[PDB]
Each structure stands twice: as C-alpha cells, then as structure tokens.
Amino acid sequence: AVPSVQTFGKKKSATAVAHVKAGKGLIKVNGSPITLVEPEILRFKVYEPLLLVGLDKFSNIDIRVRVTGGGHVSQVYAIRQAIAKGLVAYHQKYVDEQSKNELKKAFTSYDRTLLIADSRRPEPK
Amino acid sequence: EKAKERNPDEYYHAMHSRKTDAKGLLISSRHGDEEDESLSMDQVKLLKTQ
C-alpha cells in the first residue's frame, strides 16, 4: 500500500486520530475540510501548525482526522495536536529527519502543547 | 477485575490475524472461515458463469 503514519491527540476528554499519507495536499476532519471548523474563532488555532511550518510542507501530504468526545475548545485543541504530531511523524519516517528536527524546533519554540499534551494533573499541598 | 489487570504488554500470536474496529471493540466475520474473506477473480468468473 501507500506510505502511512498515525498519531494521537488528547485534550480533557477529546481524542484525535490523524492518519498521514502521501497524496495531493488535502486536509480533512470528520469528512469535512479544514475551512469548516464550527467554533469559528478557533479555526485559526487549527491552521496554527499549518502556518508555522509553511504550507509547502503540506502540499504533498494528506491528513484525515477523526475526533470524538470533549466539547468545542477541547476538540479543536485535539486536532491541532494530531496534525502537528502527524506532520512530524511523517517526516521522521519517510522524509528527512533534519527536516523533522526543524519541524519539531519550530513547534517547541512556539508552544509545547502542539507536540505533547501536558496532563493537567491534580496536586495536593 | 480482568479489565483492571490487563498488563498492557501481552502478546499472543493471534494479534496479527484478529482485527479490531476503530471504536475499540474487536470484530469477527460473519462467515468465520479463514478463507472466505473475499473472492478471487478466477472464482468470480466461474461463479458468474454458473
């Protein structure tokens, strides 16, 4: 079959399953494209790993994300994690890893939640 | 009690052939045979002739 790679994202009770395969440069979430994210103010939070990396690095990859659980804010944060993990897991497997290293550095210089999700764990004093 | 004690590192050698749905629960075929998952073109050509 075609090359593929699969990552996971996690906010409070919302999970994201993103599959990244070689293709025509199309971006899909739940069948719908990315220009139809319903919270409508957080739509720039899911374009956010797209525009930090430059749109040329998504021109030949495909992204298909399912999301279940959570609400609205927790769902959008799951999509931006799974896209950013899905891009950086494709590039560590079939593309240059120095490309992966510059892709990873461009995310952790911005924000750590795009790569791994900090579990907001309780603490007793 | 078996759910809480899964030990998520087990391997039994049927993890290849047995598949799971995307929701999480496992799937089993209606035919159940290990040979009638689909049909080849030589079988389909003969069966449509019959």
Partner: protein, 282 residues
C-alpha cells in the same frame, strides 16, 4: 506505579490466603509446644505425620497492630486529606475545615470537577495516608468515608447529630496540638478493627501533658466522638467542650480503597435481618 500497586496487592492477597491455611498449622504447632513442656498426651492426627515432626525442628523459632498498618505504624506521621463530595454547599465547606482542624497533619482541598480514579491516582502519586470525603443533606452532613490509600481498607460512616463550632459563638481558636485519644467500650473483633482503622489517623506519640483530648464513645452501637480541652486543678480535672459533636455509626468496611466499589466487603451493616435489632456491630 500502576503496575507496582497491582503487583504488591497480588502478593499481599496471596499472603492473606497463605496464613489462612497456616492458621491450622499454627494451631497444631501450639499443641507441640505445650505437649513438649506440660501435658504428655499428643493427639491422634498430629502423631502419625512425620513431615510435621521434622517441620518443628525448624518451626520452633517463631512467635496486635493491623497488618495493613504494620509497616507504617509509628515510623512516619500520617498526612491526610479532607475533601467534599461534589459542588459543596457553604456549611460543609465550613465543616470540612473543622474536620481538618480536628485532625493533625491534615489538609483540605476542594473537590470540583474531579473524578475519583484521578483523585486517588493523585494521592498515590504525592503520597498520603487516608482520605476523608464528606457527603451532606441540605447543609448538615450525613456521610463520612475514611479510605486508606496504599490499597488499604476503607470505612464509610453515617453521622447524624452534628453541631459545629461556627454555629455557636466566636469561641476563639482550636488547640491544634497533637491530641490524646480516649477509646471506650470497643470489644468486638470489628471493634478492634475499627480502632486501628481510625487511631492511625492521628500522629504518633502525643505529649505527656497535651492539653486536648478526643474521646470516642461506643455507648450504644454509635461511635460518638467529641473534642475536649482540660486542666488539672487542685482537686479535680475540669473539661470543656470544643469542636463538633458527632453521632456516627459505620455501615460498610471494604478491604479495598474507596475507588473500587467492588472490593472484598469485610463487613457490611445488615438491617433487613431478623436479628439486626438484637445486638451490636453486625
């Protein structure tokens, strides 16, 4: 962690079933110790088996705090957590502070949008001794569950007669010293069990002249607890009440933690029973 707590709970529960089989052999080995010293008759079944006869040459070198608390009985000071049920009212927010104030080495963290698996994972993380969560009924409190954390026993109580310190006056401030404990009229096997499930909630070794006393009265199948301060006068000790009066009675005692709700019920209150009204601790 999660494998470790699953591993040591397996080794503990097998060791519980091992001494269950060993209790007959320990009882039989008592007879060998008596008969070798005083009393020449040896019974019939112990007379034949030469395996036990060669067993005693080793087993002559053998010889109560509860076994879940045996390691941590006095080697460490118990840090404990008081929590509310869910979306607390103002009254038990005051009352959880008073339970935290009655209990040395206690903290009070509010519970809101937590889940009980994630709470007990957090107290197994940071390391605490036991948790006291409180339910209520329109202000006044009704339930109080004490659950010891390293897969220790939990004990759920029901409390009715609650009068608290914030209701009456501006009486001052509580003592907050390491308190003396007064335990009275506990006689049953569950009585000694409920002593050790609750005595370990205080710090080890209070002072010789500690100035507050917390009594636990068993007068009539209700463990009734009050807190008092005292002096020693020239002719008689005077006492004065402070802190919450309780009329508390346990209704279940599961061997697992409070997270489980399917664990081994060591004891449960039975009330639809012909002899339920007859006696106590049943």
């Amino acid at each position: 962690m999660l494998r470790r707590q699953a591993r040591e709970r397996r080794e503990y529960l097998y060791r519980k079933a091992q001494e269950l089989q060993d209790s007959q052999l320990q009882q039989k080995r008592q007879i060998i110790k008596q008969a070798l010293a005083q009393g020449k008759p040896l019974p019939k079944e112990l007379a034949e088996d030469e395996s036990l006869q060669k067993d005693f040459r080793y087993d002559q070198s053998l010889k109560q705090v509860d076994d879940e608390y045996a390691a941590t009985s006095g080697i460490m000071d118990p840090r404990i957590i008081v929590t509310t049920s869910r979306d607390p009212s103002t009254r038990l927010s005051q009352f959880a502070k008073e339970i935290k104030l009655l209990f040395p080495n206690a903290v009070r963290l509010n519970r809101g949008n937590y889940v009980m698996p994630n709470l007990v994972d957090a107290c197994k993380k940071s390391g605490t001794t036991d948790l006291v969560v409180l339910h209520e009924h329109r202000g006044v409190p009704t339930s109080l569950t004490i659950s010891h954390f390293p897969h220790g026993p939990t004990a759920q109580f029901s409390l009715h007669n609650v009068v608290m310190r914030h209701d009456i006056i501006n009486a001052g401030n509580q003592s907050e010293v390491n308190p003396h404990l007064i335990f009275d009229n506990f006689t049953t096997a569950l009585g000694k069990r409920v002593v050790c499930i609750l005595k370990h909630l205080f710090n080890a070794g209070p002072k010789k002249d500690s100035e507050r006393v917390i009594t636990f009265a068993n007068r009539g199948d209700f463990i009734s607890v009050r807190q008092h301060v005292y002096v020693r006068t020239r002719e008689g000790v005077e006492i004065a009440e402070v802190g919450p009066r309780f009329e508390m009675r346990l209704f279940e005692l599961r061997l697992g933690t409070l997270e489980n709700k399917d664990a081994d019920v060591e004891w449960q209150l039975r009330r639809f029973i012909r002899t339920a009204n007859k006696k106590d601790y049943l």
